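n-terminal protease npro (Pestivirus strain d32/00_hobi), 150 aa
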Amino acid sequence: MEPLYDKNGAVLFGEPSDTHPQSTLKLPHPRGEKEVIVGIRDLPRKGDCRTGNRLGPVSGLFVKPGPVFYQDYSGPVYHRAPLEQFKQAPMCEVTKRIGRVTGSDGNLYHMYVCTDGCILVKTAKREGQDVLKWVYNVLDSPIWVTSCPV
């Protein structure tokens, strides 16, 4: 299965992979000062990277099915969308765009939040386009969607 990574960027099992160069996740990058849950209507700004905000420190944006969103997280996380946990779906009405995520297939996806609360991904290229929903999460761990600019 797709590996999880610890807060220093060490793979916890399997083999490490790099993220797609045009993903909104840039590594290496620090994280995990505190776990900070945030609501969708209260996602962090780019200006909050330097200073944090009320809620607490900010290392970027994490998300898992629920949806649960974080602006910082200390535990294990995915650096790439675990496509094995996703299912092919029709395009949804989207409430928010959240980032550009590397799939476990190496490709780039647009990441969105749907009105139904699903996390959906859509290939960032025309060819072999895939739209998928995050329907299982067997390790209950977020994807790190975006890192703060260093």
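The longest helix spans residues 48-51. The first strand starts at residue 36 and ends at 38. ok done for today
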